[PDB]
Each structure stands twice: as structure tokens, then as C-alpha cells.
Paper text:
Vertebrates possess a second DCTD-like protein, [name] (NYD-SP15). In this work, we provide biochemical and structural evidence that human [name] deaminates [name] and [name].
Within the active site, the cytosine base of [name] stacks under Zn2+ coordinating H398. In the absence of E400, [name] N4 displaces the Zn2+ bound water molecule of the ligand-free structures and participates in the Zn2+ coordination, mimicking the transition state. The incorporation of [name] into the active site triggers a cascade of structural changes on an increasing scale. All the above leads to the stabilization of a large unstructured region (residues 376–390). Most importantly, the two antiparallel protomers that are too far from each other to form contacts in the absence of substrate, directly interact in the presence of [name].
Residue numbers in the entry:
A (entry chain C), B (entry chain B), C (entry chain A), D (entry chain E): 30 to 51, 85 to 162, 167 to 219, 227 to 300, 311 to 476
The structure:
Amino acid sequence: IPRLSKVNLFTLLSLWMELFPAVKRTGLVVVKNMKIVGLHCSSEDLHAGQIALIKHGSRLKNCDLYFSRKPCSACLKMIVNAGVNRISYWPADPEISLLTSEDAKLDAKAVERLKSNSRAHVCVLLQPLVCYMVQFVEETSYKCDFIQKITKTFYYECKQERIKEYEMLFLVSNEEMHKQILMTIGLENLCENPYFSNLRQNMKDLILLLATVASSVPNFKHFGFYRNQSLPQEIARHCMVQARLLAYRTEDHKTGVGAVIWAEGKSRSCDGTGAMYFVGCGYNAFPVGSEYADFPHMDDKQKDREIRKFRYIIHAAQNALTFRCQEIKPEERSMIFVTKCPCDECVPLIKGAGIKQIYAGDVDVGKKKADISYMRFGELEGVSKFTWQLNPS
Amino acid sequence: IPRLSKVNLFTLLSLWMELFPAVKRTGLVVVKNMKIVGLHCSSEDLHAGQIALIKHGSRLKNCDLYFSRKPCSACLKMIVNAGVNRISYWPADPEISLLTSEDAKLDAKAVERLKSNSRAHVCVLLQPLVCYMVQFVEETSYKCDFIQKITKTFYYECKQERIKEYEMLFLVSNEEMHKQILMTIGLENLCENPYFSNLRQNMKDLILLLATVASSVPNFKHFGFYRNQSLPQEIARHCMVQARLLAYRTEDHKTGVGAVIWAEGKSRSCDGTGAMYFVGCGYNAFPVGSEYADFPHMDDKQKDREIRKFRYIIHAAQNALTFRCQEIKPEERSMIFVTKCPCDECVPLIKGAGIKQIYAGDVDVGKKKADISYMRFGELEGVSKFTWQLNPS
Amino acid sequence: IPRLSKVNLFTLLSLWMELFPAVKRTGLVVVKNMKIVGLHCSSEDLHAGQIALIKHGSRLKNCDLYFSRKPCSACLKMIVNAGVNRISYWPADPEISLLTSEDAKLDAKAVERLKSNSRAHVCVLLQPLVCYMVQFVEETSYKCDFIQKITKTFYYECKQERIKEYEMLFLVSNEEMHKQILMTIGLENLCENPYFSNLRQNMKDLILLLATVASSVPNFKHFGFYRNQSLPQEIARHCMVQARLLAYRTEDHKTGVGAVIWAEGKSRSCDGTGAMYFVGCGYNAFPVGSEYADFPHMDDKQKDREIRKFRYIIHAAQNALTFRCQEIKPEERSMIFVTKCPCDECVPLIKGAGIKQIYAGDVDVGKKKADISYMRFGELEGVSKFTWQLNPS
Amino acid sequence: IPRLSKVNLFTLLSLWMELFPAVKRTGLVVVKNMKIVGLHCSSEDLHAGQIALIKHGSRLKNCDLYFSRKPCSACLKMIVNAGVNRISYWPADPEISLLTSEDAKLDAKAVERLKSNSRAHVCVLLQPLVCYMVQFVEETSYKCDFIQKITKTFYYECKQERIKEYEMLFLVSNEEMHKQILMTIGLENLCENPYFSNLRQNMKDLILLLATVASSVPNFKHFGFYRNQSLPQEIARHCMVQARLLAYRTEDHKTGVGAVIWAEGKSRSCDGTGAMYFVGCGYNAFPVGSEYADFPHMDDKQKDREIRKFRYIIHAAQNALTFRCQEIKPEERSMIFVTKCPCDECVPLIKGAGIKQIYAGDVDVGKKKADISYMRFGELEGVSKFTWQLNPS
Ligand SMILES: Nc1ccn([C@H]2C[C@H](O)[C@@H](COP(=O)(O)OP(=O)(O)OP(=O)(O)O)O2)c(=O)n1
Ligand SMILES: Nc1ccn([C@H]2C[C@H](O)[C@@H](COP(=O)(O)OP(=O)(O)OP(=O)(O)O)O2)c(=O)n1
Ligand SMILES: Nc1ccn([C@H]2C[C@H](O)[C@@H](COP(=O)(O)OP(=O)(O)OP(=O)(O)O)O2)c(=O)n1
Ligand SMILES: Nc1ccn([C@H]2C[C@H](O)[C@@H](COP(=O)(O)OP(=O)(O)OP(=O)(O)O)O2)c(=O)n1
Ligand SMILES: [Zn+2]
Ligand SMILES: [Zn+2]
Ligand SMILES: [Zn+2]
Ligand SMILES: [Zn+2]
Ligand SMILES: [Zn+2]
Ligand SMILES: [Zn+2]
Ligand SMILES: [Zn+2]
Ligand SMILES: [Zn+2]
């Protein structure tokens, strides 16, 4: 199966964070040592870069920041002063809108000057997807737990709606306006063909993949996460889409599973996500630093259990707990969103970590295979469980 | 005086952690930069490795883990994924008991496959003790504050009882069964003599040392820690034995002192120690990085006070506070267990650190020497003091 | 404009910390990677070094400690055990007073022995000031916001009073007594001229600068910080003087701004500052790692706005929040002291960081320049504001 | 078998380097990353420290230097300027003889002052040997290739001669004289019992071991290395003793083999070894970073060839070539001294490395075991071979 790249994952996550349910809004992904340490969105008061500064301080040192729009000079100077390594940005209309004029152009010039005189590398890191990536994402999106649950109780029309909305929000349809933006933000190297058309096509492909993933957890009928107090359904869908986007980084050759751990702070926060802050993320993969041939990749179809992937595969929730950027606070409401039903090996870890709520798929609940089972999720006590289903009330 | 090795200290501490008062139970010592950063025991729900993962996350990177039993494949894959440097284990029956069959053998095979394809080094690191180590430990154990206090108000009989119990728990008396276990867990290099007999003798010697140290703080008559609410006497004895085992790492040539700082969390935890979590450890030694001849080692017998050890020796409590892996929470109950009465330059440090309770011996209480005194412990206010004594009730 | 050096800033800050409003009292500055991570004062129970040990633990590794007095052997051994890099001290009467005898001399000998056999470098790092530095500091202090506010509603007389008091507290007027102290504390290389006279003159110049800066925020008439509950006026003045001292590290060629963030803990603390602990510090400067010609240094007088400093200069509050050594706890009272009224791009950052109180001089409040404005401080909601002012009561 | 420690090996090698065939003469061992990178001796013009400076330059950074005598102030200042980590010295009469007066005392005072004000750690690092190290060394020395070859064609009498000579050269028999030396060189912590007597006994034990090893390759009955031009027999014996001392660092449990590679430069050199300079050293051991139980330690007595040490043991010559500090220059004469006959997997490596001459023992020449053979040494062409033997003329 095709694998989404780390940088394209971070770009997609930054654009999706710009869509977190609450000068243009900006989503930001803070990555350290190729691990996500922050998911932020611009609020009405502060930009994503300012919020990242407030949240991280000097911990932004040697960090990679992925912005859904090019940050303003005020954000860029603070981010550079904090000591980050790379600032990758989505080359649409920047944070200070160029489609609104002289002040925005002056801000762009100041951003260029800051970039030219800093050790931080400000760049556009989005790369083309493989030829089959979009088709594979669509195939797995129609077949995921949530779409299957709705079907057993529409997807392409919602996907078309998401395509239109996200192409409006993230793309510059007018080629001349996009060329003007790219010239203003110092991307003259991408203003002439075939680089201009290649960049626009790559942006369109990434927007298509994002729309596919977002519609894989659709706002359809009364379907939501139900069955101690549930989150607003929009935020639950957004976090599930985050985990679903992570599921495409899987090293498993058959099934991709993603997991995001979020927590709700007691007090007010400066972030655009409100009291909710990102805690951890993960996908199912073999232990860090493993080559392709290091561990068996076969499923139960292989006769010898010793050469099956199950004893060696790290699950999405296990990776999310392992590489968490925040501690699970017992007094806070903490939620883990998993695209697949947590297995009997992961549920005790979630319970022991103190995670209060699990938002999960429901397809594999009750399955009992030789090396993996799903019996402890149905009978789990002390942790609230929310599954994709029709609203009982 | 003979000095206990760091690796043997960690092995003994993992074996003792397996005995913390509440698939076989497993103790675990997490060490970072040759400093202990975690003491864990398997609970009824989670193994020691899973608990260490939950408690540390990616902070296990480049850490040394010391297991009382060889971890299972599920624990090993998560520990390796976290990036640990070195997993040492006690070569008795592993976590998945081989003395119960096919599932345990398959788990051992998966553990060996994980070891072969990972940068983490899975090994048996226990070393032979010096010829005089056990005799010296026995001599100092009979002469310690607690045994002397009981005598001033039995030790060898309790020593024999602990020897029998710990040889039952930690050793495989049958040589053929031990050979089978070693072959299963991939220790064929130690299955034939003299390496098999050397390994068994080293294990027996370490178990004898552990029984000696555990008997030095015996469950005898109604003796316990008494004089705001005291811990259960079993946990207090266990922590005092931890500090006593640390006391044998001393650089002082005459008296070894050990100290352990523990804290009781307000909320429930996943660990087998309950709400109690390890905060810090220390022993009396010269400042880190000092050579043998760097500082004077003499005592008050030396005429010149300028060439006495007192002004240059770091006390056990000072080292426990310095290299603590956790912050002292003001709202939490925090306990420091010291094998000797805290001195007048340590009591203010304990009080200022916020440690609520001091469990200690009381032989030197009131002693006033030129370079060390014990006057501030008797008159200490704001910190609960628990000494080894008969129950006043 | 002349710039205060980092080592002189830290020496001055340690001397000022010794004067924090409540064996001689000692101030201590803990610096890591040329950033201040701790401001401590000796309490009645514990010395500054012991308090730094309690507060930081192993985080003192590779840290530079700046003491207002030479630490005692008990403090020095624990500090070098913690692994610090440099211990700079003010070469006046040490912590164990030599002007009071045999015990102090023995402590000094033990300190020298600890210094000889440790990798930590114990030294005197104070360096001569720039020739114009004192005159420039006097000129800017007379023209600072607080002195000007008093004038619009004395400074040299208060400066003379501070000169006398601080020369009494920090200098040894008798040359032979100072020579005895220097010989005892192992500074024989500075006991003969011109090095002895040069050291005494450097100390006098630094004391003069400290008196000037402390008089810039005088205890005059009923002037204090007023406008949810304010701090004691002495502590507010002390923190404002800290910020004023930081303002002389500015990279801006016209105006120096300093900011200190402190927090009042809920529970008792071992520090001499009481429940208050240092959170962060900063001054107005260009992004870290910038050369002199990297960014424009001009002001609004320059015609082109693209070559003005404003879009590239990091403000004092921005730097204080960026390089904070502590997290802003929502339940704690947090105060930021800034020598100039916070600008319109700093007030939202202070509000979003959770800082409860802003202490500031408000000369520029209401000013609206092209690239910087002060409109949001006057209308700021949710943050208590205290300005230099006559007491309204 | 007992294992000589790294630091005691380096101390013994520095003492032996002082005896290299040609203010007291000083031998010096330069070690980097626990590997020997230099063997130097004082010449008539330059001291060992000055020669090390000339030879290494800034490569002395973070190096450990082992001196047979405490270096003078001129040597010490240059060595600490070069940035070394540790200077361990043998605590006999220092480089500037204290047994000759005021100038030597002034030099010692300057050395102490340099040590006190430098991050380099000047110390005495010699450790006590295990209680049976000397007996094992004597047993293996009587049974070595050279002594056995002498017997098949005395040892204890030569051993007594070496004991007397080396106790005269390296020890201070007069206890009061040694106390005076130790006080002068700032070792007052080792001037009173039991530390004084312990240090003297440790020095005596190390001298006894050195005499044993040196007599294991004795100057006896015109025996030497014979069979294109051989070295002077004294230098060949000295290098063979170097390799023999390295042979006691072996990880093999039965047979210890050592190897030293030296090269004769074409031009004049400042070293006391003349044109000869140290190239590399090694002993037979398992691959670097291996635990005791990592690899099989068994020999041909074990039935299964897969669990024998031979396929996993790195030979002495292989380690000497691997961790060489100098390149083998084709135009220079190169000599490898190995305490055992080179095996069939070592001779091709020596030939391919360009080593011109092999000085070796010859007891195993012609032996052909299953996993190790000695057939290629007898028929080796293009490399001169010198064996312990009667002089043919
Ligand atoms: N809570 C879980 C459960 C599973 N996984 C990952 C790791 C598992 O190796 C993979 C599932 O692999 P299977 O071969 O069992 O896949 P399916 O469940 O899709 O298989 P099937 O439908 O054939 O039963 O998903 C995960 O990350 N988190
Ligand atoms: N609270 C304490 C007290 C002491 N120590 C350590 C450091 C001291 O140097 C050592 C005790 O050394 P003494 O020479 O004082 O030994 P004793 O306690 O045995 O004294 P005495 O000979 O009077 O019985 O123990 C410690 O770590 N913590
Ligand atoms: N809250 C603030 C406000 C300003 N500054 C810094 C930014 C600039 O480096 C400098 C102010 O520059 P100006 O040119 O505005 O200086 P003045 O205040 O002296 O301006 P004016 O000439 O109008 O009096 O102070 C700061 O650090 N924090
Ligand atoms: N040129 C060589 C030859 C051998 N060795 C080392 C590694 C070998 O593992 C060890 C020899 O191991 P054996 O068991 O073969 O020892 P002996 O040769 O002494 O055995 P025996 O006398 O029983 O034949 O010496 C070495 O370093 N360099
Ligand atoms: Zn911005
Ligand atoms: Zn799972
Ligand atoms: Zn396990
Ligand atoms: Zn003490
Ligand atoms: Zn002190
Ligand atoms: Zn500002
Ligand atoms: Zn010299
Ligand atoms: Zn060989």
C-alpha cells in the first residue's frame, strides 16, 4: 500500500488544523524529532505562531513548524527568535491576506527580509503524492469503520461538497492571482511553468486527499460519537479525521490505524482550539528504527505464528502514548480517538494512562483472533466509550 | 570496605521492587545517566514494562531497564520502540512463566526475534560479588540502626527465613528446569559448566545479599516506624530496605548511608506500587566525578579538620534531593527514608524541599561532633518524624 | 549606546537579589545557555546555594551560578555535585563572614580545596564597565518613565543615599580588610596593585551603576504601583529594578526596555523571595543569533518603513515569554514588570500567556505610531494593570 | 581468569615506557576514548609532556595522559592548554626530582596552582589489583611462549633482578621521604595511614606485576628475536613486553594474547623512542560493546562449533589494526609484536596492512584446529618473521 510522507502528513494536518471548529485563520503543526508536539489554530486574538510561542517558549528550538498560511512578520520574528529549524508553509494566500494591500505587501517584504537574515529555513515543503495515493485513500475511506457503519444503517456526494469547500478555502483558482501571491511572498522560482502548474497540481492533489479523509468521517444524518460528557460532535469529527490522516502513515501492509490523544484544560487557553490541547499522536508501525525486512509483515494467513506481524507491531494507541508531548493530567478530561476499535492489548494501556474517554470505531468489537482480540473494549469500566452510531436520542 | 556495583545494585533493586507490597510479578528499575529515574512493579492489570511506558513515554530513550524477569514480547516491543539503550534481566523464570506452555515458548521466541532486530541490547548484566561483599553486608546489617534498636529493646533466624523465601521466589532450584528456561530465553551460552554453575552461584550470592539486607529491617515483634499519618509498615520497611541497599554504594570508607524519596499521588496510578511513586535516591559520596584521592577520607580521628571528609562528603539525603526524577508536590504526601538519623545540614534541606515525612533510624539522634551534628532532627517542626521503635499503642 | 555585558548583568542581578525584600545574606543568579533560569536569595533557614539545589536539582548541570558572596563549603560541595559549570562570586565578604573567625577561615580553606579538585570553575567574572556606561546609565535613569512621572507630578539625592547604602553593603572600604578577605578566599593574584586597585575600582563602578538603577525606581513620597491585589511596593520596586537592569542589555540603539515575569506560588517555599519565584526575563533585541548589520536599526525617522527596526525587533515581554524558565500556572498570580508601557503586539501575548498583572511605566500609553502603538494597554480587560503613580488613597 | 583494569594497564604501560631503551626520565601513555593513541618517553632534550604536545597538538583534547612521574609546570601548562581531560601520574618522585631543591618545590607549587585553576583533572588513578592478579600473572608468565621456549632449549632469578631494579627505580623505600614527596606534590590526603600504606602497597603490587611481565621476556643466554633487518634486541623485548602487558586485558577466559604495532620513521624524531613511534595496540576480545553473556566463551571442548568463541573473538592483531592511531606507511619499516603465533585469519590481515615484520612467539606454529589454524605463518612471504630463539650466529 502507498504511504503518505511525513512532510505531506504535516502539511495536511496544518491545513486541517486551520479547520478546527471554533488576517486569515492559520493552522500550525509543531514537530520535534519527526514527532508531532503541537497542534494549534489561530484564535480571534492571537495567530497560530503567537500561540505556538506562548505554548512552547524556547522548546521551539530545532523544531519544524508547518503553517497553513505563511506567517506574518510579527509571528516569523518571534518564531525565529525561539530558535526553530524549518518553517514550511502552504503557498496559498498568507496570514496577512494579499487578496484584500500596501500593509500586506510590506509585511511580506519584512517576512522575506527576516527569512534572508536568519538561520531558520522558510520554505514550501509539500511534495507530490504517489500516483496511486489518492485512489488508495478513496478506497480505504469508503471502506472505513464510520462509512461502513453508516452504510450498514452518500459518501461521494459529501466528498464532492468537501472538495468544493476546501478548494475554495485552500486554493487560489485564479492563476494570475496565485502568481501575484507567489511573487509577493518570494516564490518567483515557482511562478513559471512547469513549476507553477506542478505546484498547483500538487496542492490540488493534497486538497483532494484532505477532502477524502474529512468526508470519511462525515457530518451525515444524526451519525456521531455516542454511548462521561461527550465532546461537541464537530470537535470529535475533527479529531477522528486527525487520527485518520495519521492512519495513512502506517507501516502495516494491510490495515492502517491512527490515534490522537487530546485533553481539555480546566482554565482558559490562548489557542484557537479552546481549552482542548494536543497530547499525543500515533499510528500502527514497527518499532522505531526498523528496516522493512526487520520484522515479519504477514497476518494470520501465515501458518507460523512466530512469523506474524502481531508480536512486533506497535499499535496506534501505543505509539500515541509513547510519543506524547504532554502528560495525562488526572483532573482533566482526556480523550483518545482511534480509527479502529482498541485491541485487548491497548485498552489496559489506555485505562492505566488515565485517559478518560475513548472515541473509536465499532466494527471489530468482539473479534477474537489468535494474536489479537477485541473483547476488553466492550466490557471496559472506568473509561467512557463513544462510538460512531445514530444518536440514541 | 567493599562496594556494591551499580549494575548489581540495579539488579537487587529490581528484585526487591518485585517484592513491593500490593504471568509472574516483575520489578523494574529505570536508570538514566547511571541515576535511578524509576522504580516500578507489575500490577494486576499491567506488567512492569507497560507501566514504565505509561509513566515515562519517550523519556525511556537511552535508558537502562533492569527487570526482575525477562519481559514479554508485548512489553519488549513497546520498550524498544521507546528507544531504550539496554534491557538487563534476571535469568530466572521470565514474565510469561515457562514453568506453568506453547504460548510462553512462542512469546520467548518473539522476544528473541525482537532482540535480534533492534538496537536495544537485551542481556543478563548481573556480576559476581567480591569475596568479602556478603560477609561485610551481614556484618553491617547486624550492626545497623534498626537491628541495634531491636537488640537494645532474632536477626539470623529472620535472615534464614528471608533466604528460604527469596530462594524460592527468585531461584530455580532444579538445574534441569533452569537449563530449560535458559535455552528457551536464548541463554545457551550459559547452559553448560562452568558458566551455568557460575551464573547460578552469582544469582545465589545476590539473593543471599538481598535476604540479608531485607532482614536488616525485619518484620519482628511490633517494631515499626512510629511517632502526619504513617505509611503501612510493609511499605515503610520496603522503602527502608531500598535505602539500605543504596547505602552499600557509598564512597565513605567507614559508614554507608542511603536515602529514598517517595511520594503518594492524590489520584490512582497504573503502577503496582499504587499511588506511591519513586521520587529520588541517594547515598553518601563525594561530589560526582571525583577520584579516590581527590578528597580527604578521614574522620574526627585526624587532627586537622581541614583534611576530614565531612566538609566534602555529599550526604545521602542531599544526593537524593539533587538527582530526583520528580518534583516534590506541595499538596502530595512525600516521605524520605534514611538509614541514619538526618544530620543538621540535611534536615533544613529536607524541610525546604517540602518533604512531609522523614522515616529514619535514631541511633545518632542528639550526637554533637565537630563537623557533624544531629540536634535539628529531634526539634524539627513541620515535618512528621517516624523512627524504628516498638508501637507506642 | 553602551551595552552592559552578560557577566556584569548577572553580577549586578545577584547583588540586587541579595537586596530582595524579606552568615550573610546572598543573592544568586542561575543562568543556562546565557539565559537566566533562576533568581534566588538566602532565607533565614537556607543559603542561596542550598535553595538553588532544592529548586533545580540536576538541572544545575552545565549552569553558571552568580553569587553575591562566595558560597560556603556546604553550598559549594552540593553545587559542584549537581554538575554546574562556573561559580562566579562577588569578591566581598563571603557567605561565612570573615569580618566577624577560625570556623570561617576553615570554611574558606575547604572551599579552596573543593575548587581545586572539581571540574567546576570558581572565579570572579566581574569586568570593567565601558567608560561611558555609568554616565549613560545615569542619563537614561533620570529620563526613565518612573523618574519622569515623579517629575511631572529628588533623584540625585536618592541616588546618593543608595550609593552610601550599597557601598556599605557590598564594598570593603578598608583596603587591608579587603586584602585579608582576598587572601583568605584564595584571590592572592588580586592582592597587589594594580590588580587590587583595578578590582576595587571595578566593584565601585558596578555598585555605582546598581545604585543608579535602583534610584531610577525610588522609594519617594507616596509613589508606587497602583490602578487584582497589588504586591507589596518594595517587591514591585525590586522587580522593576530587575527589569531596568535588563533594559541595559538592549540591542536597540535608542531605547532599552526590560521585562521580568515573576509568579506567586500558593504553597510555602524555601527561597528567600518567599512564595514568589522567577519565571522569565527579557529585553528588546533582534532575533537570537543576529549580527549587527543583519537587520535595520532605524526608527520612524527613516522614510522607508521596510528598513525600520520595528518589524524585526523582539520586544522585552516577547523575549521574557519566549525564554521563560517556568510555566505560567493559571491558578497562580503571575506578574510581568516592564520598564515601558506594553505595546499593541505585546499586550495580547501577555493576556494569552495567562499573566494576571502588568506592572509598567505608562509614559507612552495612548501613542499611535506607524509601526508601533500603545492603544490596547489602556483598554485591556482581564489583566490587572499597575502603573507608577501617586497612591490614589 | 582475573582481568587487569584499563587504568592499571595504562599506569603499567607508562612506567614501562619510562624504561624504553635509549630532571628524571618519564614515560607517558596518551589514551583517547579508552584507546591508546600514544606511547612516549622523555628524551635528553624534551620531556614526555613536551613530546606529546609536539606529536599530537590539539588532538590531545579530551585525552587521558598517564605519566610515570608528575609532569613539571612547563609540561602541565602546555598539556592543559591543549585541552586534555585527565592527567594521572605515578606518585613517586616527580619529573623535577624532589630527591636532589627550592626550584623543584617551586615547580611543584606551580603544578598545584595550575591544577587548581584548570578544568583538567590531575590525579593518582592507580587501583589496587585483585588479591590473585599477581599470582595469575606469574603463572601465565612462567608458561608463556618465550619462557617455555627457553625451558625447552632461570625465570625466577631474572624476576628477582627485575623486582629489585624496578623497586629501586619506581618506588621510594623510605617512608618519610615518600611522605615528604607526597606533601610536596599535594597528596596530603594519602600521607597518613591506612591510605599511605595502602598506596605504597598498591604501588609495590603494580611494580611486582611489571617485573613479572618484564622477566617473562628476559635478557637471557643470548636469546632473542631472530630468523629484513631486525630491531635492536632491547627494543624488541620492550615492545614484546608492551604486547604482553596488553595480553592481560583479554576477554578470553583461557588464553590472553596481546599485539603492538610500531613503526620506524625515516627522519629524526623528538621522542625518547627515537625514530620509532607507536602505531596501534590490541588484545583478544569480543567485539566492542559486548556483554559477558553476549557471545559464546567456549573452546573446541564444546561439542557444537556454533557455540564456540572462535568465530566471534577479535584477535589481538585484528584489534591492533582496527584501533591504530597511525597509518601504516609503505616506505617505513613496520613491526607487529604479538605474544602468540599469528593465526591464519590474522597473517593475511597483517600482510595486507603493509606491516613489514612480525615478531612473535612460535609454540603454536603448525597447529591446525577446527576453528583456528597456524599454517600461514610458517609459509608467509613478503613479511619478515622474527621469533624467540637462539641466535643462529
Ligand atoms: N487497537 C488497534 C488494533 C490494531 N492495530 C493495528 C496493528 C495490527 O497489526 C493491525 C491489524 O492487523 P490485522 O491483520 O488483524 O487486520 P484486520 O483487523 O483488518 O484483519 P481482518 O479483517 O482480516 O480480521 O492494526 C492498532 O494499531 N490498534
Ligand atoms: N544524615 C546523614 C549523616 C551522615 N551521612 C554520611 C556522611 C558522613 O560523613 C557519614 C558519617 O561519618 P562519621 O565519621 O560521622 O561516622 P559515624 O556516624 O559512624 O560516627 P562515629 O564514629 O561517631 O560513630 O555518613 C549521611 O549521608 N547522611
Ligand atoms: N512594549 C514594548 C515597546 C517597545 N519595545 C522596544 C521596541 C523598540 O526597540 C523600542 C521602541 O522604539 P521606538 O522607536 O518606538 O522608541 P521610543 O519609545 O523612544 O519612541 P519615540 O521616539 O516616539 O519617543 O522599544 C519593547 O521592547 N517593548
Ligand atoms: N593470532 C592469534 C591467535 C589467537 N588469538 C586469541 C583468540 C583465540 O580465541 C585465542 C586462542 O584460543 P584457544 O582456545 O585456541 O587457545 P590455545 O591456542 O591456548 O589452546 P590449546 O592450547 O588448547 O590448543 O587467542 C589471538 O588473539 N591472536
Ligand atoms: Zn502572525
Ligand atoms: Zn491495539
Ligand atoms: Zn509484559
Ligand atoms: Zn546528613
Ligand atoms: Zn552556604
Ligand atoms: Zn512591546
Ligand atoms: Zn616537563
Ligand atoms: Zn590471530
